[PDB]
């Protein structure tokens, strides 16, 4: 009878083990979502990402190219993948309705700030983690940024950095904690994520 749609492009820096996830939790999603995907990773598929290689990525193939490779011909949305990293250099391909970080190597946060401000700027609402580690259990929540714990070495910086209005997701425990990054923690974290994506999209309106 009364038939509703895709609004928005939604912008996700981060294309690994959790990126991926959300692309794919965002591609799936029917009667809504995005109508503009945009993805931005500078990484290849290696031996060591079987969540890739199981769903058919050939080695060496950029994760932006196999994404973009499951939006065929005839898929109703836009897919597109953009192979680099972003720097200070092309923050010009960071814009839309919603921006959502999910980098890892390395020290992150200067880029990802960078990310939030130059995307706000352009009035883009932001969403990132603030560690993703875990073996299981631990839980996945939400909270914006100056409501952040401040020990937690992300929500620090980014307050510090001045950034207001962005919105937080992950379980807390990190990269200098003892757990390992584990399969059900990134499905969680990434099904929390898209959630998250969705509310902020219909803010766009
Ligand atoms: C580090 C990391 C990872 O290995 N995997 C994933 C998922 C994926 O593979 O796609 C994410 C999202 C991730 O990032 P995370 O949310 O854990 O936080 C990244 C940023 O958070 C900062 N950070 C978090 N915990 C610590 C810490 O315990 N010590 C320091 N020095 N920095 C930290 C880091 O500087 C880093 O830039
Ligand atoms: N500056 C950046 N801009 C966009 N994406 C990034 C940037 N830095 C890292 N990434 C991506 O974030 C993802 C992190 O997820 P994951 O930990 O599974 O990958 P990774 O193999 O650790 O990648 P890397 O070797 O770059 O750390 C990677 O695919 C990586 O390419």
Same mark, same amino acid.
């Given at each position: 009878?009364?038939?509703?749609?895709?609004?928005?492009?939604?912008?996700?820096?981060?294309?690994?083990?959790?990126?991926?996830?959300?692309?794919?939790?965002?591609?799936? #999603? +029917?009667?809504?979502?995005?109508?503009?995907?945009?993805? %931005?990773?500078?990484?290849?598929?290696?031996?060591?990402?079987?969540?890739?290689?199981?769903?058919?990525?050939?080695?060496?193939?950029?994760?932006?190219?196999?994404?973009?490779?499951?939006?065929?011909?005839?898929?109703? /949305?836009?897919?597109?993948?953009?192979?680099?990293?972003?720097?200070?250099?092309?923050? /010009?391909? %960071?814009?839309?309705?919603?921006?959502?970080?999910?980098?890892?190597?390395?020290?992150?946060?200067?880029?990802?700030?960078? #990310?939030?401000?130059?995307?706000?700027?352009?009035?883009?609402?932001?969403?990132?983690?603030?560690?993703?580690?875990?073996?299981?259990?631990?839980?996945?929540?939400?909270?914006? %940024?100056?409501?952040?714990?401040?020990?937690?070495?992300?929500?620090?910086?980014?307050?510090?950095?001045?950034? +207001?209005? +962005?919105?937080?997701?992950?379980?807390?425990?990190?990269?200098?904690?003892?757990?390992?990054?584990?399969? +059900?923690?990134?499905?969680?974290?990434?099904?929390?994520?898209?959630?998250?994506?969705?509310?902020?999209?219909?803010?766009?309106?």
């Amino acid at each position: 009878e009364g038939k509703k749609v895709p609004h928005g492009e939604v912008t996700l820096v981060g294309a690994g083990r959790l990126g991926f996830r959300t692309a794919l939790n965002l591609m799936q #999603i +029917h009667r809504g979502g995005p109508e503009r995907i945009k993805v %931005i990773d500078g990484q290849k598929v290696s031996a060591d990402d079987l969540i890739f290689r199981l769903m058919g990525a050939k080695i060496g193939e950029y994760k932006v190219k196999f994404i973009e490779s499951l939006a065929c011909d005839g898929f109703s /949305r836009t897919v597109q993948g953009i192979p680099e990293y972003i720097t200070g250099d092309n923050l /010009r391909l %960071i814009g839309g309705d919603v921006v959502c970080v999910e980098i890892a190597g390395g020290d992150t946060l200067p880029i990802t700030t960078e #990310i939030i401000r130059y995307a706000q700027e352009r009035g883009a609402a932001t969403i990132s983690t603030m560690g993703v580690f875990g073996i299981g259990e631990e839980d996945v929540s939400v909270v914006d %940024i100056d409501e952040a714990d401040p020990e937690n070495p992300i929500a620090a910086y980014l307050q510090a950095e001045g950034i +207001h209005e +962005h919105v937080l997701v992950g379980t807390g425990k990190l990269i200098r904690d003892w757990e390992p990054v584990t399969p +059900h923690v990134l499905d969680r974290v990434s099904e929390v994520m898209t959630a998250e994506i969705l509310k902020l999209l219909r803010g766009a309106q």
